Amino acid sequence: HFEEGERVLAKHSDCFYEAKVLKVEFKDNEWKYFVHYIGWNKSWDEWIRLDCLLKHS
């Protein structure tokens, strides 16, 4: 659904932030995405699930 390198919106807590997908993995019948939040410390990088992601536009 999303690819390595892709600009996306990623939900953290209550709202969506500009982010970039760094890694994609599939395990236990589900996709997960390691995302970086644009402009933010790398310490906030995290694995999130598909329903936490939005394509732009």
Author numbering: 51 to 107
Q: What does the primary publication say about this deposited structure?
A:
Firstly, via their chromodomain, MRG1/2 proteins act as readers that recognize methylated H3K4 and H3K36. In addition, MRG1/2 proteins bind to chromatin that contains tri-methylated H3K4 and H3K36 via their chromodomains, the bound MRG1/2 in turn stabilize the binding of CO and ultimately controls the activation of FT transcription.
H3K4me3 (residues 1–9) and H3K36me3 (residues 31–41) exhibited detectable binding to MRG2 chromodomain (residues 41–123) (Kd values: 0.8 mM for H3K4me3; 0.69 mM for H3K36me3). The proteolyzed samples were analyzed using mass spectrometry (MS) analysis to determine the protein sequence, resulting in the identification of a region containing the chromodomain with residues 53–123 of MRG2 as suitable for crystallization. MRG2 complexes with the H3K4me3 and H3K36me3 peptides were obtained, but the complexes with the H3K27me3 and H3K9me3 peptides could not form crystals under the same conditions, consistent with the ITC results. The crystals of MRG2 with H3K4me3 or H3K36me3 were diffracted to 1.68 and 1.65 Å, respectively. In both structures, the MRG2 chromodomain contains mainly four beta-strands. However, the predicted alpha-helix located at the C-terminus is missing in the electron density map. For the complexes of the MRG2 chromodomain with the H3K4me3/H3K36me3 peptides, the recognition modes are almost the same; therefore, only the complex of the MRG2 chromodomain with H3K36me3 peptide is shown in Figure 7A. The tri-methylated lysine projects into the aromatic cage formed by the His62, Tyr67, Tyr87, Trp90, and Trp94 residues of the MRG2 chromodomain. The co-crystal structures clearly indicate that the chromodomain of MRG2 can directly bind to tri-methylated H3K4 and H3K36, and provide strong evidence that the aromatic cage of the MRG2 chromodomain and the associated residues are essential for the binding, the same as other chromodomain proteins.
